[PDB]
Write an enzyme that holds these catalytic residues in place. Structure first.
Site, PDB file in Angstrom:
ATOM      1  CB  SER A   1      40.594  44.950  32.608  1.00  0.00           C
ATOM      2  OG  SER A   1      39.890  44.909  33.831  1.00  0.00           O
TER       3      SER A   1
ATOM      4  CD  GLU B   1      33.023  47.902  32.284  1.00  0.00           C
ATOM      5  OE1 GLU B   1      33.770  46.983  32.652  1.00  0.00           O
ATOM      6  OE2 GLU B   1      33.156  48.475  31.183  1.00  0.00           O
TER       7      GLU B   1
ATOM      8  CG  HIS C   1      35.284  43.721  33.341  1.00  0.00           C
ATOM      9  ND1 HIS C   1      35.573  45.047  33.090  1.00  0.00           N
ATOM     10  CD2 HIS C   1      36.467  43.124  33.604  1.00  0.00           C
ATOM     11  CE1 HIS C   1      36.874  45.240  33.184  1.00  0.00           C
ATOM     12  NE2 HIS C   1      37.441  44.091  33.510  1.00  0.00           N
TER      13      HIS C   1
END
Ligand SMILES: *[C@@H]1O[C@H](CO)[C@@H](O[C@@H]2O[C@H](CO)[C@@H](O[C@@H]3O[C@H](CO)[C@@H](O)[C@H](O)[C@@H]3O)[C@H](O)[C@H]2NC(C)=O)[C@H](O)[C@H]1NC(C)=O
Ligand SMILES: *[C@@H]1O[C@H](CO[C@H]2O[C@@H](C)[C@@H](O)[C@@H](O)[C@@H]2O)[C@@H](O[C@@H]2O[C@H](CO)[C@@H](O)[C@H](O)[C@H]2NC(C)=O)[C@H](O)[C@H]1NC(C)=O
Ligand SMILES: *[C@@H]1O[C@H](CO[C@H]2O[C@@H](C)[C@@H](O)[C@@H](O)[C@@H]2O)[C@@H](O[C@@H]2O[C@H](CO)[C@@H](O)[C@H](O)[C@H]2NC(C)=O)[C@H](O)[C@H]1NC(C)=O
Ligand SMILES: *[C@@H]1O[C@H](CO[C@H]2O[C@@H](C)[C@@H](O)[C@@H](O)[C@@H]2O)[C@@H](O[C@@H]2O[C@H](CO)[C@@H](O)[C@H](O)[C@H]2NC(C)=O)[C@H](O)[C@H]1NC(C)=O
Ligand SMILES: *[C@@H]1O[C@H](CO[C@H]2O[C@@H](C)[C@@H](O)[C@@H](O)[C@@H]2O)[C@@H](O[C@@H]2O[C@H](CO)[C@@H](O)[C@H](O)[C@H]2NC(C)=O)[C@H](O)[C@H]1NC(C)=O
Ligand SMILES: *[C@@H]1O[C@H](CO[C@H]2O[C@@H](C)[C@@H](O)[C@@H](O)[C@@H]2O)[C@@H](O[C@@H]2O[C@H](CO)[C@@H](O)[C@H](O)[C@H]2NC(C)=O)[C@H](O)[C@H]1NC(C)=O
Ligand SMILES: *[C@H]1O[C@H](CO[C@H]2O[C@@H](C)[C@@H](O)[C@@H](O)[C@@H]2O)[C@@H](O[C@@H]2O[C@H](CO)[C@@H](O)[C@H](O)[C@H]2NC(C)=O)[C@H](O)[C@H]1NC(C)=O
Ligand SMILES: *[C@@H]1O[C@H](CO)[C@@H](O[C@@H]2O[C@H](CO)[C@@H](O)[C@H](O)[C@H]2NC(C)=O)[C@H](O)[C@H]1NC(C)=O
Ligand SMILES: *[C@@H]1O[C@H](CO)[C@@H](O[C@@H]2O[C@H](CO)[C@@H](O)[C@H](O)[C@H]2NC(C)=O)[C@H](O)[C@H]1NC(C)=O
Ligand SMILES: *[C@@H]1O[C@H](CO)[C@@H](O)[C@H](O)[C@H]1NC(C)=O
Ligand SMILES: *[C@@H]1O[C@H](CO)[C@@H](O)[C@H](O)[C@H]1NC(C)=O
Ligand SMILES: *[C@@H]1O[C@H](CO)[C@@H](O)[C@H](O)[C@H]1NC(C)=O
Ligand SMILES: *[C@H]1O[C@H](CO)[C@@H](O)[C@H](O)[C@H]1NC(C)=O
Ligand SMILES: *[C@H]1O[C@H](CO)[C@@H](O)[C@H](O)[C@H]1NC(C)=O
Ligand SMILES: *[C@H]1O[C@H](CO)[C@@H](O)[C@H](O)[C@H]1NC(C)=O
Ligand SMILES: [Cl-]
Ligand SMILES: [Cl-]
Ligand SMILES: [Cl-]
Ligand SMILES: [Cl-]
Ligand SMILES: [Cl-]
Ligand SMILES: [Cl-]
Ligand SMILES: [Cl-]
Lengths: 526, 527
Positions: free
Chosen positions: A195, A322, A435
């Protein structure tokens, strides 16, 4: 178990891992505590200490807002800091095989958290397993997040922007000067993160000060060209002035604005961060990377286009779903407690929340591009499309677009598509392969036969851990086992990528090409 | 002697020798009073009687129209120019009958196209002698008024009410009902067919209550009323009328004085001004065409279609592969019938402004985005092919599909074709592919004539299309044979099956250009 660094000795602790031993050194200071006159400034190099530093427990996590949207829920709480918050948080961790290696590859982990949260001490970042199985040295640092890390009055050394990035870079500098003493090879250092961690790594490919500080790079679900990664100078200045306003620090000149901000209690800064961006999204990054003219000598997309970045090998990738994590943080109709079947209109409300500044034509054109159903009976069509809208735009398409340009300068690139949903994932099934939920597989948590997880999940992690290590060591994420599945280079034309799952991994091409074409070639015109 | 007594008088015909057989042709039978003087712009008036025996042995006058003269001596363009004298006295029809005389033959009525501004029933590619010979059906075609003379509109005003040309078609249908039996025809087995504006016309007879009992079934080749060029709103029509009046110096106090002045103009004076009643036209512009007149059409056709307010019968609908290419050499920059017309991206964008004059920059940009996901680049012909597909999909293919879908939701059998064969005698360059209007020669059976230089394969294809059209007319099912024949399934809104027509192999496919048409029906309107 003691080691002499360039600043002094550090005592470590012996961990027993999988019958073997790993030596851990938790919470070594790598900069001076950014307190008082030092808040908002770049990290100051550390000076020697007399006695021995006990590196036997994780350090303070850096000041940050806590996610308390779902009290008592493991899915949200697992990302919250597990040690005390403090501005005195510039520390790192080193894990080492036993017996001690002679010239071992080093993996440096940079955590994510939208540049507003995160800590190196999370259970899902425990580097002891990697050290044990692949015999690498693993390092991870805490870096300043939020305003404290990224508040920018551009051009002013008292609050220059990118302070958290300089934290990471200072920790990289520490490895260079000190890792040989731990049995590591400073000349073989691979950066990895997820991320904002991945976007951080990608920015380290760009910063000349970071050029000599590592070797290869692994980017999980993130890159600097993602729409949340980098804030323009105008926006960064606006946000900073909004914060001064919110905290009673609106002043006549910048030097006084900062004096006043240095006197606010940390919490008066933290609890005002949410208000600085007038129409934020669940993906809004309040204070993040900017073009400071120091760390980032120019706008990133230009540096990349022109060709001035570290020429090396990369490994990039994304998870299948995601975008789903953010839907339960404010998209109407959604909830982790039901199936979240929404309507066309709730979907249009969703777009409004995720795309606040965008024209009605623009939103209408997104709706059109994501409503060409395979089965038009399917009631979860809109729920899935919104998740894909958010995943493709924020993560997947930026990641592919980064890899194309990077590889176009003659660099080996390897792209993965992670498709396995952990059998332990606390979030409901409709959220899919979320995610962040490949991290535990990379760090090898399912290798622990007492940890729950399936056998297949142990095998899956075994190979990921093997490819990551081999990419670090060799520049090719090759696996052993005469079976294997042979990972090919990423090229702008064919765009080959490897899928990762428990029932057969295969080589595909042009990931989400039809969807990404919209975001790269049309959306910037609406 | 060859003589048939009709309601209007006796008519003499002529024998034609076709394929070792005989067809009896009656060309140029009047079916209405000549719309001259005070009858100009009015609905057609019924024919009382003619004197003596009318000799139907030559085609009649074509209706007044402008002529395509962009390419002198070029067969590709000149084959559509009228081939008889031009005149206001043009309300005639043609009848072809098998010999020996049938007792109850199925009748096919052909309605030509030409964008409601041009056309004539006497073109060689509409010769009905072949269909009569081979399938033993009766073939009828009529002249109907085109342009301002056909579609000048001041609705509510009987001096120039709009849709006169459509009412010409209707009166001819009525003549068939009254008379075809005397020719051995079955008035209860009548199939309308037409191409382009002819097909738009056929689709309009499905909606018009006055037409409902004058035919049985309907075939629509490359056209339908819901195409963007087919129907003008009531006040856009009036506006055009008012402007024509200004251009010709006939602007007056009241409406009837305006018409009064327009009745004194030479046809040529009216004809030469038609192209200026519209401020910004395209190569596909219909200056004077169908509109909501309150008589023929009681409401906007899309509404009638949505509401199931139309004749409940079987239809056969289709389009050609390269519908749009023909229009590009008539206005788009970079294009030429004597070039391979490789154009740039900028030429493409200029073409878009030509074909989409009033569309916003973002509207055009999204058409561009939708049509440029290239299979292969740089591949020079991408943009050339893209613009042809844009024009074709938007004006012909997507409306034809949308019409069939909506028509079939009300319970009648619909059959859709995709014509993919390029005539070996097509005079236009290769890059224009399977052009608009170039299935017609196959439908009428011209390749059946061996002295004509078509390939054997084109003869086989045409023989097969002739059989299926004739079977559709006779039975409502466009079958060929039971056994050794690919079956043509119905078009249903779910599967949307259609039949490809070409010489290689005919096969059943689904959802024709669904990804392109999705853009034209569900995104473009909001633009
Ligand atoms: C194509 O398919 C249709 C079915 O939809 C077939 O229609 C049938 O046609 C036969 C004549 O072939 C009709 O039966 C007979 O008609 C003749 C007059 O032509 C008459 O002499 C006989 O006494 C009898 O009525 C029949 O009514 C009709 N059936 C239906 C329900 O439509 C057609 O035969 C097929 N053609 C081919 C070549 O496949
Ligand atoms: C730069 O700042 C201004 C002001 O931002 C205010 O926004 C509030 C949410 C709150 O954080 C407060 O502390 C902060 O000062 C932004 O302009 C505002 O935009 C809104 C419309 O969305 C208007 O209603 C306001 O009038 C306007 N500001 C004011 C208070 O006059 C501005 O958007 C921002 N610039 C950027 C980069 O977005
Ligand atoms: C793997 O699972 C076991 C127990 O299995 C599950 O049982 C569920 C009903 C629920 O309790 C769930 O939390 C649990 O994972 C875990 O062992 C138990 O863990 C709890 C704390 O959550 C302890 O209080 C128990 O003493 C303990 N023993 C039992 C019941 O066998 C185990 O912790 C877990 N492992 C990991 C690392 O996730
Ligand atoms: C239609 O044509 C006929 C002449 O042409 C036909 O005459 C038939 C008797 C027959 O032989 C047929 O094969 C031939 O094509 C016109 O004939 C009129 O009557 C006689 C017969 O020939 C002629 O001598 C006359 O000149 C002619 N009448 C006139 C006006 O002089 C017939 O008039 C014509 N009808 C029309 C409406 O023009
Ligand atoms: C109906 O149409 C007129 C268009 O005016 C036309 O006049 C014709 C004689 C011809 O020359 C043609 O090329 C021309 O466009 C619209 O008039 C517009 O507005 C004024 C008159 O009120 C004119 O000065 C303008 O030129 C004209 N527009 C443009 C850009 O040409 C009129 O608005 C329209 N009305 C309706 C109800 O549709
Ligand atoms: C039966 O006729 C076929 C051709 O008839 C074809 O007609 C199409 C419209 C469609 O219905 C299709 O299913 C059907 O097969 C004959 O095949 C032809 O044979 C010649 C040689 O004699 C080949 O050169 C042609 O390519 C071929 N036509 C095709 C396949 O389109 C065939 O003679 C006969 N078949 C049988 C089994 O008797
Ligand atoms: C930027 O601002 C600070 C403080 O702003 C001061 O501006 C003064 C003109 C006056 O309005 C004062 O009330 C206000 O606080 C400046 O600091 C000031 O410096 C002057 C001497 O130049 C002193 O007399 C003031 O007491 C002092 N204020 C305080 C509280 O420190 C500062 O000089 C200025 N710096 C820059 C970079 O412009
Ligand atoms: C017009 O065609 C008809 C039909 O073919 C011809 O009339 C036929 O002629 C043959 C031979 O003379 C006869 O066996 C048929 O019985 C005739 N039919 C009828 C109904 O009489 C006729 O010859 C042609 N007329 C011409 C050439 O003007
Ligand atoms: C031609 O065929 C039609 C049928 O297509 C016959 O016309 C009538 O058909 C209706 C139904 O539409 C029946 O109700 C009638 O019984 C038929 N009429 C008669 C008098 O029987 C017509 O008979 C045929 N014409 C012929 C053979 O000359
Ligand atoms: C733990 O520490 C000792 C030194 O105190 C070290 O030599 C050894 O590697 C570790 N022992 C084991 C096997 O856990
Ligand atoms: C360091 O660790 C040892 C062993 O647990 C402990 O006895 C000692 O008190 C620690 N030293 C410091 C800095 O307190
Ligand atoms: C699921 O929960 C949310 C939040 O409580 C609620 O708004 C939504 O209506 C629910 N969805 C369904 C399927 O009822
Ligand atoms: C590591 O080993 C030495 C330093 O101990 C160094 O000279 C050498 O170049 C390094 N290379 C590797 C990967 O062994
Ligand atoms: C993979 O690891 C490195 C790649 O350069 C090399 O030493 C080794 O031979 C490779 N093995 C396989 C099976 O690809
Ligand atoms: C050919 O088409 C016309 C010929 O007049 C011309 O304008 C165009 O540029 C030519 N196209 C090309 C470049 O082949
Ligand atoms: Cl942001
Ligand atoms: Cl200021
Ligand atoms: Cl700057
Ligand atoms: Cl195993
Ligand atoms: Cl024959
Ligand atoms: Cl070509
Ligand atoms: Cl069939």
């Amino acid at each position: 178990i003691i080691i002499a660094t360039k600043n002094g000795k550090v005592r470590g602790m012996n961990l027993t891992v999988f019958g073997g031993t790993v030596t851990a050194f938790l919470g070594i200071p790598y900069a001076q505590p950014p307190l008082g006159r030092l808040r908002f400034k770049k990290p100051q190099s550390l000076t020697k200490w007399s006695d021995i530093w006990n590196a036997t427990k994780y350090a303070n996590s850096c000041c940050q807002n806590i996610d308390q949207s779902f009290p008592g829920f493991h899915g949200s709480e697992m990302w919250n800091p597990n040690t005390d918050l403090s501005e005195d948080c510039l520390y790192l961790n080193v894990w080492i095989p036993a017996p001690k290696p002679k010239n071992a590859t080093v993996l440096i982990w940079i955590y994510g958290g939208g540049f507003q949260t995160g800590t190196s001490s999370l259970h899902v970042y425990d580097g002891k397993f990697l050290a044990r199985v692949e015999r690498v040295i693993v390092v991870s640092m805490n870096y300043r997040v939020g305003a404290l890390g990224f508040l920018a009055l551009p051009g002013n050394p008292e609050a220059p922007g990118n302070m958290g990035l300089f934290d990471q870079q200072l920790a990289l500098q520490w490895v260079q000067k000190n890792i040989a003493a731990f049995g590591g090879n400073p000349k073989s250092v691979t950066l990895f993160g997820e991320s904002a961690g991945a976007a951080s790594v990608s920015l380290h490919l760009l910063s000349p000060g970071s050029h000599s500080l590592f070797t290869r790079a692994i980017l999980q679900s993130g890159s600097f060209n993602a729409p949340w990664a980098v804030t323009s100078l105008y926006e960064a200045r606006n946000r900073t002035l909004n914060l001064a306003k919110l905290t009673g620090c609106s002043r006549e000149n910048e030097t006084e604005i900062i004096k006043c901000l240095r006197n606010k209690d940390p919490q008066e800064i933290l609890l005002n961060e949410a208000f600085v961006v007038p129409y934020g999204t669940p993906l809004s990054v309040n204070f993040g990377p900017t073009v400071d003219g120091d760390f980032l000598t120019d706008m990133p997309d230009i540096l990349l286009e022109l060709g001035q970045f570290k020429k090396t090998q990369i490994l990039v990738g994304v998870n299948k779903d995601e975008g789903t994590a953010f839907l339960v943080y404010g998209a109407p109709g959604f909830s982790k407690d039901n199936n979240s079947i929404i309507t066309r209109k709730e979907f249009q409300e969703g777009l409004k929340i995720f795309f606040p500044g965008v024209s009605e034509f623009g939103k209408e054109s997104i709706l059109f591009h994501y409503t060409d159903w395979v089965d038009d009976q399917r009631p979860e069509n809109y729920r899935e499309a919104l998740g894909d809208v958010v995943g493709d735009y924020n993560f997947i398409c930026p990641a592919l677009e980064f890899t194309k340009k990077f590889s176009e300068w003659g660099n080996n690139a390897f792209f993965y598509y992670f498709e396995h949903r952990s059998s332990k994932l606390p979030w409901p099934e409709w959220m899919g392969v979320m995610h962040g939920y490949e991290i535990e597989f990379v760090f090898g948590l399912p290798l622990e036969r007492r940890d729950n997880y399936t056998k297949a999940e142990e095998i899956l992690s075994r190979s990921i851990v093997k490819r990551w290590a081999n990419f670090a060591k060799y520049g090719n994420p090759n696996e052993t086992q005469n079976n294997s599945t042979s990972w090919p280079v990423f090229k702008s034309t064919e765009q080959k990528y490897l899928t990762l799952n428990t029932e057969s991994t295969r080589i595909m091409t042009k990931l989400r090409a039809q969807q990404c074409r919209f975001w790269t070639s049309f959306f910037p015109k609406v």
